[PDB]
Amino acid sequence: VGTRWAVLVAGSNGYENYRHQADVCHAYQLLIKGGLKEENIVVFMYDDIAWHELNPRPGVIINNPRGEDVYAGVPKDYTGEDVTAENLFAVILGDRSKVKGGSGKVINSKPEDRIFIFYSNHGGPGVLGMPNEQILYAMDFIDVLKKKHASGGYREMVIYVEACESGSLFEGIMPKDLNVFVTTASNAQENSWGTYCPGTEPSPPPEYTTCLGDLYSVAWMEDSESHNLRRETVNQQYRSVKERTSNFKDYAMGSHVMQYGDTNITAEKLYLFQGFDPATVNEAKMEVVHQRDAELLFMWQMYQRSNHLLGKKTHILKQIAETVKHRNHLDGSVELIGVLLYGPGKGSPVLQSVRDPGLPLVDNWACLKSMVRVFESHCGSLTQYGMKHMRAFANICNSGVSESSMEEACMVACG
Amino acid sequence: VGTRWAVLVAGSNGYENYRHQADVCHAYQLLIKGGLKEENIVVFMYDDIAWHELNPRPGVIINNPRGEDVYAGVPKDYTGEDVTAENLFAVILGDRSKVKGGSGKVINSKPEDRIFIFYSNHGGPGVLGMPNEQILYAMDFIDVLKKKHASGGYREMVIYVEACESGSLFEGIMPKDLNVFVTTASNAQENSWGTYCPGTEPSPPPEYTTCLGDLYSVAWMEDSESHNLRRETVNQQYRSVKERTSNFKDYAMGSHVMQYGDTNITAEKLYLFQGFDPATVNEAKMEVVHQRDAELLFMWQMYQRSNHLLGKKTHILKQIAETVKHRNHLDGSVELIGVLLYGPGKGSPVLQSVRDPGLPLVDNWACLKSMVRVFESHCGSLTQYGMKHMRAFANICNSGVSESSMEEACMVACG
C-alpha cells in the first residue's frame, strides 16, 4: 500500500564533475527498472554533461566501464539555474507554490508513501554543494525533514549522501523520530572518493578524461542492480556498501560509511524504497581519486592529451596554475584568519579540531552562515573546494570569537 | 702541543632571531673561560641584537633564564654586511687575502692545532642561512673542509651545527678521512627548536618577547660549562646533548642529534677543542618552538603586549598578515611548480620524498643552485623560511627534469 517516490540530486556542474550527474542518471534508470514511476522521481541535474563539447560520446552518459548509457529518458525536472537549495526544499516538502522554474514536479506524497533521496557531489563539514554558487547547510536540510514529518506526508524515508565529510551533515543533529534512515559515504572527518578514473584500475574507456562515478554511489547502485530487492534488506545494502567503500579497510583510499536516524528501517526490504526489477533472481580493490582533486586530474589528462599542440598545451597549464592559485588563496586566507584570531601555533589546532562523534559540528548554524558571509565579502566566493573550510568557520563560531573580530581578521587577511 | 681555534657563526639577523646570536655569544664566553685566546676565536654575528630598540636590557644579551650577560667582550670580527659565506670560507681556510672587510682575523692554523666550529640559525635540506640574503650550500662547506685538510692546517676539528634538517648537510657527502667530527641538532628530515621562549616553561624573564636560545645549542653549552672538560669526552657531550635535544624521546617536541665524520675523535677529551675552566670540579622537559615559527611567536607577543594601543596593535596585525602571506606565496608557488612538472597527485610525492639515510640530498649541487636561481628569478627571493623547500628543488634535480622545464614551470607559476 502506497507509492514510492525519489529525489535524485547532483550538486555540481562542469565536465570535471561528470561523475555526479552520471551517478544520478544511473540511479534514475535503476529506480525506473524497479517500477518507480517517472512522475514520482524528481531529478536535479545541471544537465551540462551529455552534450558537453568535451564528451567523447555526445548525448550519452555512462557510470561504469561497461559503457551502458544512463542519460536517455532522464527527465529535466530541475536543471541549469533551477538546481537550487530552495527548489530542493520545495520539492521535498511537496509544495509546488514554492518552486521557481523547472517542471513543477514535487514530492506531493501521502502518509502511506515511501521516499528515497540520493545526493551526489561535493561537500564539506556540515555542508553540501549546489551548482549555482550556493551552499546547502545541514541544519536547513534537517529542518526540511522535520517540516515534512510534521505534515504527515510519508511513512518512511531512506537518504543516501555521497559528499566529503558527509557524516557531519547528520552527527548531533539528525533525530531518530522522523521515520528517516540515512547513510553517508564518509564520516565527519574524511573525504569522499571518485572512481572509474582515467589512468587508474578499474579503468574507464580510453576516450574518457574524467572519472565515471563515485565510490559509495556506484557501490550502492551496482549492489541494488545485482540483487533481488524483495529479499535484500536496507541493512544488507548498508553492510555491502560499507565494505566496498572501505576498499579492503584501507582508509588511505577508502572511507567509513556511516548511518544515522531511525535504524529500525534497516530491517525493511529494499524494494519498499527502490522497487524491484522483475528480471533479477539475485570483489577487488578500486583505485580512487579524492573528490577535491578529481578536477586537477581531469585538467592534467587534457594537458597530456594535447602535448602535440603547443598553444593548447600552454593554455591548459595556465588554467591548472589559476586553479591551484585559487585553491592556495582560499587555504592560505583561512589559515591566516586563524593566526590573526588565535595566534600562531593555536590557529591551526583551533580551526582544525574535530569534535567527538555524536556532537554537532556547530552550535549556532546562523553564526556558521555569517562566518561564510563575512569571509566571502573580503576574500571572495568560497567555491565548492572552499567547503573544506566549513569546520574552520564552525570552530570560529564555537570558540566564542565575535563576528566583529571575524570582520577585522578577514579585512586584514584579504583587503 | 698546539693551539685551539674556534669559528662561531650566527646565520641570521633581526630581533626575532635573538637566540642565534645569544647562542654564539654564550659559546664565545665559554671558550674564553676555557683558556682559548681571543685571537684564535673568530666571531660571525650580524650584531643587531644588543642595541636593538626592542631589547629590554640595552647592551646586554642573555642565553638562558639565569640572565647572565654574554655580549660584553665579544669581538666584532665579521658583523653586519661582512657576515657572508665567502668570509666564512676565507676564515676557515686561514686566507686573509680572500677576506672582505671585518677584522681580518682568520684560522691561520698549524698542523698540530685543533679547531672547533659552531653554527646557529636557520637552515633547510642541504643548506644553511647567512644573513645578507645568502644561502650557504652543504657541498661548498664540505669542499672548504677538504681544502683545509689538503693544506695540512690542523690536527682535528669538531663542528656543531644548530639548524633545521641539519643532518642533510653531511649525509652522503661528509668524508670520514678529514680528521673532522660533526654533530647536528637534527636529522635530515626534522626541524630544529628554539627554547627559553616567552609564554613557555622554562620561562625567560618577563620582559622578553623572543626566545633566548636554541635547544641543541644550550644543551651543549650548559653541558660543557657544568663539567670538567679534562675528563668529559666528545662522545659524552654528544650523548648528553642527544638525550636533551630528544626531550624525553618526544620527537613531536624534540629532534634526533646526528653524528658524521671521523668518530674516532669522540674518544678525545673535550678540553682539546673547548679548553677547560680551572674553577670547575665536575633534567626536566623543555617547552620548545619550531625554528620556522619563532618569528610569528615573537610578533604575536608584540601584538599582545600592545593591546592597549589601537594604532600599534593594528600595525603589528598587518605585519603578521604580510609575513604569513609571504610564507603562503613561497609554499604555494613550490607546490604549484610540482603540479606543473609532475602532475597533481605526483607533485607532492616527488617534491617531498626523502632519500634513505646515508644518501646525499642531491646528486648535482650546481643543479640545486640553478633551481634556486630559476625559482627566485620568477617567484622572488627564497628568504630564510624558504630554505624549507630545498629538498623540493633537490628532488627536481634528481628527477631528471630539465632547467628549461623548470623555467617554464616557474614562469607559469609566478609571472
B415 touches chain A (CB under 8 A): no
Phi, psi of B42 (to 5 degrees): -100, 125
- 3-class DSSP assignment, residue B228: coil
What residue type is assigned to position B303 of the chain?
Y
Given an 8 Å threshold on Cβ–Cβ distance, is B332 in contact with A332?
yes
CA distance B171 to A62: 53
- What are the start-end ranges of the E strands in B19-86? 41-44
Distance from the Cα of residue A341 to its chain's centroid: 31
Residue B301 placed within a domain: no
Beta-carbon count within 10 A of B312 CB: 14
Q: How far is CA B183 from CA B23, B146, B180, B237, B245, in A?
A: 16, 18, 10, 10, 12
Give residues 71 to 100 of A whose Cβ lies within 8 Å of B.
Answer: none
Q: Are residues A139 and A234 in the same domain?
A: yes
In the annotation, is B122 catalytic? yes
Question: Quick one: DSSP state of residue A338?
Answer: H
Q: Are residues B189 and B149 in the same domain?
A: yes
Residue B102 placed within a domain: yes
Residue A297 placed within a domain: no
CA distance B304 to B289: 18
Q: Is B246 exposed, middle or buried (0-12, 13-18, 19+ CB in 10 A)?
A: middle
CA distance A206 to A106: 39
State the Rg of chain B over Cα.
21
Which residue among B225, B257, B290 closes a domain? B290
By C-alpha distance, the chain B residue nearest A296 is: B344
List the single best residue of A314, A328, A406 to mutate versus B (max B Cβ within 10 A): A328
Measured in residues, chain B has a length of 415
By C-alpha distance, the chain A residue nearest B327 is: A332
**Structure-block grid coordinates of residue B257:** 642529534
DSSP string of B318-366, one letter each residue: HHHHHHHHHHHHHHHHHHHHHHHHH-TTTHHHHHH--PPTTS-S-S-HH
Buried b (16+ CB within 10 A) or exposed e, B194-231: bbbbbebeeebeeebbbbbbbbbbbbbbbbbbebebee
What residue type is assigned to position B209 of the chain?
T
Q: How close, in Å, is residue A265 to chain B by CA atoms?
A: 40
- 3-class DSSP assignment, residue A382: coil
Q: How close, in Å, is residue A325 to chain B by CA atoms?
A: 7
CATH code assigned at B355: 1.10.132.130
Q: How close, in Å, is residue A334 to chain B by CA atoms?
A: 11
What residue type is assigned to position B374 of the chain?
V
Which strand (E) or helix (H) includes residue A350? Answer: helix A347-352
Question: Quick one: DSSP state of residue B10?
Answer: E
Domains in chain A, number: 2
Beta-carbon count within 10 A of A278 CB: 11
By C-alpha distance, the chain A residue nearest B301 is: A343
A111 touches chain B (CB under 8 A): no
Q: Are residues B262 and B316 in the same domain?
A: no
Q: How far is CA B257 from CA A80, A336, A393, B165, B249, in A?
A: 61, 33, 40, 10, 11
Phi, psi of A127 (to 5 degrees): -140, 155
Find cell 574518457 and name the residue: A208
Residue B298 placed within a domain: no
CA distance B51 to B60: 8
Distance from the Cα of residue A392 to its chain's centroid: 20
Question: Quick one: DSSP state of residue A128?
Answer: E
Find cell 642565534 and name the residue: B20
Question: Quick one: DSSP state of residue A355?
Answer: P
A59 touches chain B (CB under 8 A): no
Buried b (16+ CB within 10 A) or exposed e, B46-57: bbbbbeeeebee
Phi, psi of A207 (to 5 degrees): -75, -10
Q: Are residues B280 and B357 in the same domain?
A: no
- 3-class DSSP assignment, residue A214: strand
* A41-44 and A4-10 beta bridge pairing: parallel
Distance from the Cα of residue B130 to its chain's centroid: 9
Q: Are residues B179 and B318 in the same domain?
A: no
Q: Which residue, among A201, A185, A204, A370, has the nearest Cα to A260 in the 3D structure?
A: A185
B15 touches chain A (CB under 8 A): no
Q: Are residues A334 and A253 in the same domain?
A: no
Distance from the Cα of residue B48 to its chain's centroid: 17
Q: Are residues A366 and A284 in the same domain?
A: no
A332 touches chain B (CB under 8 A): yes
- 3-class DSSP assignment, residue A374: helix
Given an 8 Å threshold on Cβ–Cβ distance, is B300 in contact with A412?
no
Given an 8 Å threshold on Cβ–Cβ distance, is A296 in contact with B412?
no
Contact B194, B294 (CB under 8 A): yes
CA distance B131 to B10: 8
CA distance B15 to B56: 11
Domain membership of residue A362 as a residue range? 306-414
- What are the start-end ranges of the E strands in A163-286? 180-184, 193-195, 213-214, 258-261
Contact B255, B165 (CB under 8 A): no
Q: Which residue, among B26, B46, B10, has the nearest Cα to B220 in the 3D structure?
A: B26
Measured in residues, chain A has a length of 415
CA distance B49 to B16: 9
Which residue among A289, A314, A344 closes a domain? A289
- 3-class DSSP assignment, residue A195: strand
- 3-class DSSP assignment, residue A377: helix
Phi, psi of A197 (to 5 degrees): -95, 150
C-beta contacts of A31-36 below 8 A and 24+ residues apart: A31/A6, A31/A116, A31/A274, A31/A275, A32/A73, A33/A225, A33/A275, A33/A277, A34/A224, A34/A229, A34/A271, A34/A274, A34/A275, A34/A276, A34/A277, A35/A4, A35/A275, A35/A276, A35/A278, A36/A4, A36/A5, A36/A6, A36/A274, A36/A275
- 3-class DSSP assignment, residue B195: strand
**Structure-block grid coordinates of residue B123:** 637552515
Phi-psi map region of B215: left, alpha, beta (phi>0 left; psi -120 to 50 alpha):
alpha
Which residue among B260, B290, B320 closes a domain? B290
Q: Residue B288: beta bridge partners?
A: B195
Phi-psi map region of B343: left, alpha, beta (phi>0 left; psi -120 to 50 alpha):
left
Q: Are residues B237 and B368 in the same domain?
A: no
Beta-carbon count within 10 A of A124 CB: 28
Cβ within 8 Å of residue A275, ≥6 positions away:
A4, A31, A33, A34, A35, A36, A229
Distance from the Cα of residue A60 to its chain's centroid: 22
A289 touches chain B (CB under 8 A): yes
A344 touches chain B (CB under 8 A): yes
**Structure-block grid coordinates of residue A46:** 545541471
List the single best residue of A209, A334, A340, A407 to mutate versus B (max B Cβ within 10 A): A340
Resolution for this experimental structure (Å) = 1.4
Q: Are residues A318 and A250 in the same domain?
A: no
Q: Are residues B178 and B222 in the same domain?
A: yes
Q: Is A21 exposed, middle or buried (0-12, 13-18, 19+ CB in 10 A)?
A: buried
Catalytic residue chosen out of the listed positions B25, B164, B197, B367? B164
Q: Are residues A284 and A315 in the same domain?
A: no
Residue A300 placed within a domain: no
Which strand (E) or helix (H) includes residue A399? Answer: helix A390-399
Question: Quick one: DSSP state of residue B256?
Answer: -
Residues of A noted as catalytic: 122, 164
Q: Which residue, among B251, B258, B133, has the nearest Cα to B193 in the 3D structure?
A: B251
What residue type is assigned to position A146 of the chain?
K
CATH code assigned at A184: 3.40.50.1460
- In total, the C-beta contacts within 8 angstroms joining chain A to chain B are 64
**Structure-block grid coordinates of residue B112:** 698540530
Q: Residue B213: beta bridge partners?
A: B195
Give residues 306 to 325 of A whose Cβ lies within 8 Å of B.
Answer: 317-318, 320-321, 324-325
Phi, psi of A236 (to 5 degrees): -60, -40
Angle between helices B310-342 and B365-379 (to 10 degrees): 120
Order of all β-strands in the sheet with A41-44: A41-44, A4-10, A114-120, A156-162, A180-184, A258-261
Given an 8 Å threshold on Cβ–Cβ distance, is B321 in contact with A413?
yes
Residue B189 placed within a domain: yes
Cβ within 8 Å of residue B75, ≥6 positions away:
B28, B38, B41, B43, B103, B105
State the Rg of chain A over Cα.
21
Contact A3, A40 (CB under 8 A): yes
Residue A377 placed within a domain: yes
Beta-carbon count within 10 A of B380 CB: 14
- 3-class DSSP assignment, residue B154: coil
Q: Is B296 exposed, middle or buried (0-12, 13-18, 19+ CB in 10 A)?
A: buried
Q: Are residues B326 and B203 in the same domain?
A: no
CA distance B304 to B309: 10
Q: How many CA atoms lie within 13 A of B323 on its CB side?
A: 21
Contact A19, A213 (CB under 8 A): yes
A-chain CB neighbours of B293 within 8 Å are 344-345
**Structure-block grid coordinates of residue A413:** 587577511
CA distance B210 to B199: 10
* A127-130 and B180-184 beta bridge pairing: unpaired
Residue B230 placed within a domain: yes
What residue type is assigned to position A199 of the chain?
G
CA distance B79 to B131: 10
Given an 8 Å threshold on Cβ–Cβ distance, is B293 in contact with A317?
no
- Using CA atoms of A149, A150, A151, A153 in order, give the dihedral in degrees to the nearest 10: 20
